Design a protein around this nucleic acid. Sequence first.
RNA 1: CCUUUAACGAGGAUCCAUUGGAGGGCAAGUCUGGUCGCAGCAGCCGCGGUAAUUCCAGCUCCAAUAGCGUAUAUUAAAGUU
RNA 2: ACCUCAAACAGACACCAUGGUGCACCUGACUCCUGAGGAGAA
Lengths: 142, 226, 109, 59
Amino acid sequence: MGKCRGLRTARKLRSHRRDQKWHDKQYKKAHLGTALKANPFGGASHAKGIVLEKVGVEAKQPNSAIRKCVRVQLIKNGKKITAFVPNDGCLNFIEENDEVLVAGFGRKGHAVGDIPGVRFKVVKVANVSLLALYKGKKERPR
Amino acid sequence: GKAGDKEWLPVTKLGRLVKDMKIKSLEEIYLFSLPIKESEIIDFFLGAALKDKVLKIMPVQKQTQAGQRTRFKAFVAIGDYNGHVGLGMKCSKEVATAIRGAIILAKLSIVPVRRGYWGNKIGKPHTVRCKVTGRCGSVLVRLIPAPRGTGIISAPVPKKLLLMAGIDDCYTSAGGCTATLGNFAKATFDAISKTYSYLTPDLWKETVFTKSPYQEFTDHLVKTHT
Amino acid sequence: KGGKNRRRGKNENESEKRELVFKEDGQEYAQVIKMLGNGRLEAMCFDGVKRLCHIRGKLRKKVWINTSDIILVGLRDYQDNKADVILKYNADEARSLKAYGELPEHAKI
Amino acid sequence: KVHGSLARVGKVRGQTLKVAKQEKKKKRTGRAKRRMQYNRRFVNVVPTFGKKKGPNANS
RNA sequence: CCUUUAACGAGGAUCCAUUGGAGGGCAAGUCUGGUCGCAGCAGCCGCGGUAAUUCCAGCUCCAAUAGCGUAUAUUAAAGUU
RNA sequence: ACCUCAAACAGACACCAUGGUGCACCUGACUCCUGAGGAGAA
């Protein structure tokens, strides 16, 4: 309520809504494309890179742990992304200066859990999954 | 070994007329809009079709200089599948006592519902007569009539109450904070009340103003009875 | 602290004294260089390599590690620059270790 | 204690015992798996006074 | 290839159903062993500081099923355009 | 003088800062029949 309800006010409605839609956060990222330019991804679900070097990443309080991530440079941008490594002992199955395949966490822009500064994780080392390396139904191909 | 109950000696006038069995239905009581002040009156007319469905058992607690003190507050629904439902809240120090306090209170607050048809008749009403609402502090419900066999299309909370009411078909929609279910269920119950308090063209013919049971059966009550 | 209260709801204490791992493989003795804030801290290892030390759970606010003094540090399996604190000692324990001739004889307390 | 640093990975998984008791018994599929599920829950017919039991209880 | 037809072709040990989960949201363990704020889990809320219903394993149980999980775009949920 | 109206009214202030940390859901409603013929006797 508190607004026009004319019969010839189609212009004053459809131009107002087209302006006040930009104050929404979601809409403003989709249509400016500043999302694409700023992201290390092109909007692609995955991406591929080459390892730079292992790191240890401290946890946010209350939790205290060391989380053993990696840091990676990409093939098609040359810029750098810091990527989590999953389950116990899977760090060892990643060896420095090889290729890897990365993927987002599942929150689509934001850092997940108690680990800060990480927005990406790792899925395949070299056409072989972290699962089959971990479980033992496959072996290192080298 | 030793046998025989003796339970329920009325201290209430209305209770005594039921115990002597000169009031033959609850429908007389509701027509004069009397209070019901005892929980055995209802449990005399019914008691072999009333089920209970304990919704939530919620803690609350205040603060004092010795720390916390917690009391348990539970909601308990009640209704037979012929048109009578009720609802009650109660709190107590412990759990079982609060539940049993609510099963009493819900019987006390029991009311009838009015059921109606969609757009045509084939006997036995299956849905709500008219499109009504009911609000309890920023929660509201919009019970909308529905055709046969659609089922009750609602959230889990009102689906209890409406199913016990015998209202088998309904469309609904909520507005506001339904997370705090104490509002949500009381607002549903509010809506279900309004069904006989909504004027329809059927009811436009004038009532005959028949004399009250209080008046007619007063002859037995001139002894010492109150 | 200077007495106070609310310091007994929780497990007094103390070090009933005790004894004495080392080094182990990537798990060796260092000396505090500085004393940063936030939480982390600096500590040069006794071998010659520098490193930056990090605090460990529990030892958080359960044990204060003033500036200057020996302390037990694990090395990260892969990382050089950052390393991970363990198990501190006592100043008496550190001078007994020095007298034994197991850590290098270079730092004073 | 913890000795040989606490940054070490493979720790918990490389010091646990590994045991098994792999099946000889073949489990059912498709139709019959639903048949047993129907009978074992509803058509037995066991249920008694109000209880919390669940369909599992190794307590 | 399919359909149609000879001749061989089922005793459950193999002519082998998997993919996820069991603290709450949300259907299913306050079982046993190991680890002890370490290693890890955790969309979210939170689990681990020697008695872990949440970690690593065993057993059991639950869901869907020749399919199931994960990442990303997008709609419904949103009367939060 | 005494004697003849009838309402309330204490007053000004030096200084005085800061507290190593890890606590507190594991919460539900059909049961009594113990005994009595018992016990002595049996």
